[PDB]
Amino acid sequence: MIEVSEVIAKVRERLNDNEVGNYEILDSVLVENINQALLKICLEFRLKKAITRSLITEEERFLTLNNLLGIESVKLDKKEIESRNTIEKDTGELELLILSDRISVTPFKIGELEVVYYTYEEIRNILETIKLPKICLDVLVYSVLCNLLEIPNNETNFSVLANYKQLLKLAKDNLTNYLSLMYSKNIHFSKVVRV
Amino acid sequence: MIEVSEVIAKVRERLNDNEVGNYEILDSVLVENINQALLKICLEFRLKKAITRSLITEEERFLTLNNLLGIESVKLDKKEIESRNTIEKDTGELELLILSDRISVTPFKIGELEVVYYTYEEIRNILETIKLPKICLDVLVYSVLCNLLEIPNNETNFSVLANYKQLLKLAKDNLTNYLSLMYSKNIHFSKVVRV
Amino acid sequence: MIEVSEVIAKVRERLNDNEVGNYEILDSVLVENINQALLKICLEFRLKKAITRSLITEEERFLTLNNLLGIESVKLDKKEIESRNTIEKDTGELELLILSDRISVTPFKIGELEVVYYTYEEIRNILETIKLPKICLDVLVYSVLCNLLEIPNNETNFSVLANYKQLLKLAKDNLTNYLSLMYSKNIHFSKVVRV
Amino acid sequence: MDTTRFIRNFILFKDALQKQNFNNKDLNTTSMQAALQSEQLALSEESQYLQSE
Amino acid sequence: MDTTRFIRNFILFKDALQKQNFNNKDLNTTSMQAALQSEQLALSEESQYLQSE
Amino acid sequence: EANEQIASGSVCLFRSDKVRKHTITFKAINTKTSLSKNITISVIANKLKER
């Protein structure tokens, strides 16, 4: 778990804005930028998988998720749902209807939905805590810092942004290392193709 | 074993901040950065392997580890656990559930867990001691020093950071040399493939 | 044998700090840096081989070595110990347990340990003497000197460090020449492969 | 130079040139040069104010 | 120059230009040049203060 | 500030090592009469060294 205070402190130090009195960058701006960074980080690395198992009937037809990034598996009464669409097809094959963070089934059928998806748990207060591995700290800083360096404070801000991009790439490499060590098999040989 | 005092002294000297009175960089910042460096070093090199052998029943279902980096072997009653997941699958193959430094078994079964993982033993005080090989000193300095050089104190801080990156690469080469000499076989020929 | 006084004098001269009164670099710093240089030199070249032949029983289970760099041969009652580990495996093949300068046997068996390893004999006083070949002097200077040049005394310190790196490479070449002439066979032809 | 007026002018020039837009070394250098020029101007200010008094 | 005023101004300029943002050689050089300019200004300060007294 | 002699004649070099506003008295004594005069020198700490 990462506290927001330490991310904020590192960003303030890096922006030469570690002054309690002045705060040229408002904390609302920093919290919004941290939300954006959490968005991008959780989308690119698929950090947070969530499972929701609800029921849809004729009364309520939609399943309201929260902070949706992507759906990787849908079951309806232990039956695979195959295609995804946003158009509300009248009849045909059974598809999953996505309505911008509302989930239903296109040629509607009474039943239950077991959906696997991805989530943010974004923050709104400086005293909150980000439920992410500590290795994700440097990728949060260097990603939110590139978002703020492009305020035209200095004539050489974009070269500094370019340097921070490489630093961010290295941080992402570290994060990928961690994720592979956690959630991946410890294998050393491949399997023969069986057809 | 490395004392924190000597790491701190080298970093202070290198940052032209070896002044007892002033301390432009607070010691809390240095200890946090040293924790970050220990994170990255222990993750990349898999320095610390730990074994935990506990029991999970219906009363308490999760195994709280500490400073987790990766799992490389799981046994349940001397039975290999194969896949890893974070989604709490209802039924199927027997998988290991990871909940951000909490370990359980996905289609839960009463038993015991023998888990091999990786650890930090991070520090919190300047008078503490880092339980790492002394050869790891230069990789701790040069890695925490690149984390602080990118405070915009000077207009030529990033070239200095680039030089310290190469120095860090050489330090990591030395560390790999040491690790191979310690924890690796002393062999001089390969074995023939036996199929 | 190399006296510490002459290493220190050469480093002081090279750093433009050969002033008895001032001593901008404290002698504690120099002795610590010389310890680091001895570390790196003895690790890379495997200069010092030591043999320890002790006994491990149920009372005391660990063998405390000193300034360990690597193990190249382990015998237990004139039986080869094959693998190395740091995890305290309960049962299985017979492995060597390494606990950061403490040596034991993993599936513990009463007996004796004959271990070949590598050592520092680091220094702590300016009046001490380094028990190394005199040819190792220039590699001690040029290696400890690159460790001190990266104090930001001058804006052109890193180019000077780069020059001293090449000088150090030549010194290491000389040292390799010496080591081959000492501890290697005087042969002029290879042997035919016998399978 | 007068020391305390130099310190106050150095602080004021570090407030005018705000440090969010500035690298710290160039900020301190430009503030020091402007404070030295302000001292060189304030000498003539002291002479002119003595004459006007 | 006056020596002790030069030493105090050199110390004060090394405090204003803080050494964390500065390479040591350029820090000492800029502090020495600013202290010499401060001595050149303080000569005219002595003349103007004698006239005002 | 009471009577404490800090110089000898017509010149004074006032080191402070304090924070307060000091009041120094120039005194000219004679066999006939005596005169005194006050000056106020205020001391501050260095604003750069603080915090």
Automatic annotation (TrEMBL), chains A, B, C:
It comes from the Viruses. This is Uncharacterized protein. It comes from Helicobacter pylori bacteriophage KHP30.
TrEMBL record, chains D, E:
This is Uncharacterized protein. It comes from the Viruses. It comes from Helicobacter pylori bacteriophage KHP30. The chain holds residues 1 to 53 of 265 of the full protein.
